[PDB]
From a paper:
As the spike glycoprotein of SARS-CoV-2 mediates the virus entry into host cells, it is the main target of NAbs and the hotspot for designing therapeutic agents and vaccines. Omicron carries the most significant number of mutations among all SARS-CoV-2 variants to date, with 37 mutations within its spike protein, 15 of which are positioned at the RBD and cover almost all the critical mutation sites carried by previous VOCs, such as K417N, S477N, E484K (E484A in Omicron), and N501Y. The Omicron spike has 37 mutation sites, 11 located on the N-terminal domain (NTD), 15 on the RBD, and the remaining 11 near the furin cleavage site and on the S2 subunit. To delineate the impact of emerging mutations on spike’s properties, we performed systematic structural analyses on apo Omicron spike and its complexes with human ACE2 or S309 neutralizing antibody (NAb) by cryo-EM.
The S309-bound Omicron spike trimer was then determined by single-particle cryo-EM. The one-RBD-up conformation of the spike-S309 complex accounts for the most significant proportion at over 82%. The S309-RBD-RBD-S309 region was also performed local refinement, and a density map at 2.66 Å resolution was obtained. The structure showed that the interface between the down- and up-RBDs is maintained after S309 binding. In addition, the epitope is positioned in the outer face of the RBD and is accessible in both up and down configurations of the RBD. These two features make S309 retain binding and neutralizing capacities for the Omicron variant.
Residue numbers in the entry:
A (entry chain M): 330 to 529
B (entry chain E): 332 to 516
C (entry chain D): 1 to 108
D (entry chain B): 1 to 105
E (entry chain A): 1 to 124
F (entry chain C): 1 to 126
Write the structure that this text describes.
Amino acid sequence: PNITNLCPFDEVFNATRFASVYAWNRKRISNCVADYSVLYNLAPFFTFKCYGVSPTKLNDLCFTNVYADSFVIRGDEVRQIAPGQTGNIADYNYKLPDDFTGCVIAWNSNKLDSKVSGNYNYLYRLFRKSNLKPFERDISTEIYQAGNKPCNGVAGFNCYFPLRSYSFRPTYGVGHQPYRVVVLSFELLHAPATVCGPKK
Amino acid sequence: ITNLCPFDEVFNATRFASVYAWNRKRISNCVADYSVLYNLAPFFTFKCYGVSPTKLNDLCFTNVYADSFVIRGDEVRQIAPGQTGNIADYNYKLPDDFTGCVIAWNSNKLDSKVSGNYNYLYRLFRKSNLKPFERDISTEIYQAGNKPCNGVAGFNCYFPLRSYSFRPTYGVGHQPYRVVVLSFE
Amino acid sequence: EIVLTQSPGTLSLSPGERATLSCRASQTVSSTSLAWYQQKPGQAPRLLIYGASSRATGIPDRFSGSGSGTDFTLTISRLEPEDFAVYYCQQHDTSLTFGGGTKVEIKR
Amino acid sequence: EIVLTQSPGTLSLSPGERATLSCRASQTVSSTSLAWYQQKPGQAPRLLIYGASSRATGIPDRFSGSGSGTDFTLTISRLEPEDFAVYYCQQHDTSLTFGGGTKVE
Amino acid sequence: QVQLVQSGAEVKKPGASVKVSCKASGYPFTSYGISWVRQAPGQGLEWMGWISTYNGNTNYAQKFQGRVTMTTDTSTTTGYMELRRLRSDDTAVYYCARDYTRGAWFGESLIGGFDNWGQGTLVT
Amino acid sequence: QVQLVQSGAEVKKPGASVKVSCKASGYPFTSYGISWVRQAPGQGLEWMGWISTYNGNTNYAQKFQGRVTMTTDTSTTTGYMELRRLRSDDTAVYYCARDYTRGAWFGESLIGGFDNWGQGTLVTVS
Ligand SMILES: *[C@@H]1O[C@H](CO[C@@H]2O[C@@H](C)[C@@H](O)[C@@H](O)[C@@H]2O)[C@@H](O[C@@H]2O[C@H](CO)[C@@H](O)[C@H](O)[C@H]2NC(C)=O)[C@H](O)[C@H]1NC(C)=O
Ligand SMILES: *[C@@H]1O[C@H](CO[C@@H]2O[C@@H](C)[C@@H](O)[C@@H](O)[C@@H]2O)[C@@H](O[C@@H]2O[C@H](CO)[C@@H](O)[C@H](O)[C@H]2NC(C)=O)[C@H](O)[C@H]1NC(C)=O
């Protein structure tokens, strides 16, 4: 199809603020020519390992709709962003389906999202009654009663607050450093192609 | 079931150790039921770091540690990872890799004397900061200046340990508080 | 060791009045290590108050106690006809010992 | 709005040694949202540093910048006849504001 | 290479309104926005506003909120700037710059700055 | 619930020995101790000693320093008290009680007291 506009992949990678893990941002990219070559040309520190499709063949396919998700998590929790995984982030904040057909990208962000005094602007959820379905958001602050005695929205022993903070500082090691994650999802079926790829 | 862990031998003891002489207990080969602290003493402050508090009865560990001491009422805040102060730096330091819980509660009715109790002492002047999980049961003449003294207290020679003199009429932040710390391995 | 003492040996009060039992110690005894017991005739003793302040499981609210240092006292708000027995005071600050005992019976 | 102040207003320096400029922010400005510009007389401004550390396309290695929070600094290793102009400092943490401008002679 | 060429100078009398153009060449027009900066003679720069070339959204400065309107046309790849109720203290040089400080499709902040300026237009 | 059951009475004669059994059910056996107290008819109570059901560490009184020894069997949940060199002065009722006054694992004191008592075994020596 003949479409002129180009896809805004620089609008989701070179952004200023990235959302927290429990309120992750989702964008819709459609009706544009996608050039993924800019992603590989970056220096060999981007962890561009992805599933269902090889990175090199992305330039010759058409996709119905491409969704981009972005959030900031801990350095050693990047392993948990993969199909068929379990953990704190995988079971309470972000869940990926077993059939994903997308790509996952992550890179270091120590120089930008870490402060010497400590950054408490990033949050993650620690308490939930049940695991969450794939691609679900739970933006709700409320006391969680682990025990049986009820509380009228007040902090307590068996009454908990479900959100904690990361406390990023430049003094920790690589495993505690903040990382920025961008996850791309592709849909293929009907294909009234919106994302086309560069081909004449 | 059988072989229940001895968590009632460390919370209901008669005499609690001093801060500089914080006892250490070894717990192994026992089924741990964390329901004992799930309902007790409705004035205690429970905070756990490195693990979800309401997931304890789901995990298998190797060894479990338990240390107990009596500190001041307003000093309970200093017992936490990534925190500093007089008690934290100088008497008991909790490392960042804590993976454990901390419990504290009021102990007025058992650790108060009308004439003042002098059984609890702490170190106010050390040569250097201590490493995490380090204990120094040693009192020696503390020199702050440059002229040494032949083991005699006086100017520039201070006894490194100080008492507490708990009294029933003091404030909430001055009353004795009993603290137990559990470290998982 | 710490030698304990109770007085009076025998009390003769009304079934319904307010009574009081006294226990005397020689040396100082930690308040965390003193308790009381009740021995109904023809049975075995049972625990009433532990720590000199806390009430044992299954003990009515009419029972209470207080004291510290050397003199300890157990107070009964009201006398009842299931409360005529002999009572004891215990310490385990150093080793362990039992008191002489105090008996309360009907006055008439 | 965040107000940026540059001192000194003018720098008289010998042709060949190292210079240093100041852009201090009243409030806290993220390191993501600061940039520098150069304006030779009778021309148009051009971009030199973005992100307070990174370098724009076509700018030699003698221009460098650093700083965080409240204090930001632009440094030049050595001077050339083409490096005597007015420099500005930009922020877009909240709205978008410019600086007073420092001249070098 | 990227180049932007503006219109010519104007001698508009006080009280009227003026329009300035800016034609782009050398890059995908839709992927970037256009910002406007003005410089009075003998003073420093000042920010006018921001216009998106993909969906027409605008973000004007608080000083010129109800006075300036911006418009872009994709066919000719040219931006327009309308300033109404001109005052004697508006004599300056207006600039047209390619914007990397704010996203075009989504309108979020980015890492960068005005990376390509025009020749400049003098208005009195 | 918690119930303590003992053996029957004895009519032992001087120079002999006697064994007292104590069986319990309703609590983890390796958590608490066992203590023995005897009482002559008409007099007060009298302590004997403590035994730990975890490692066999034991503590005894002074007047019974060498005349007594105690054992426990974890599988059967029972403890035994041995008293030797019996005399006519030991005509008393011997009691088995669950102890919460010293810890089973570490040997430190606790806040509490004898919380459960058995029926009582009567022994007469003549
Ligand atoms: C994120 O931005 C970098 C750098 O952006 C440069 O500065 C901006 C103000 C704007 O003018 C951009 O056009 C500039 O490129 C991008 O990295 C550059 O990518 C181009 C394209 O291949 C390349 O020619 C340059 O050498 C790169 N420069 C550097 C310093 O890496 C980067 O591509 C952007 N991110 C994405 C996902 O596109
Ligand atoms: C510390 O001891 C209290 C009280 O213990 C009671 O008295 C002792 C002499 C002994 O007989 C215990 O078995 C008694 O329970 C414990 O508090 C009790 O806890 C149980 C179990 O949770 C509860 O059913 C009772 O109601 C509680 N009683 C009171 C008065 O609070 C407490 O659990 C002990 N500490 C720990 C850490 O276990």
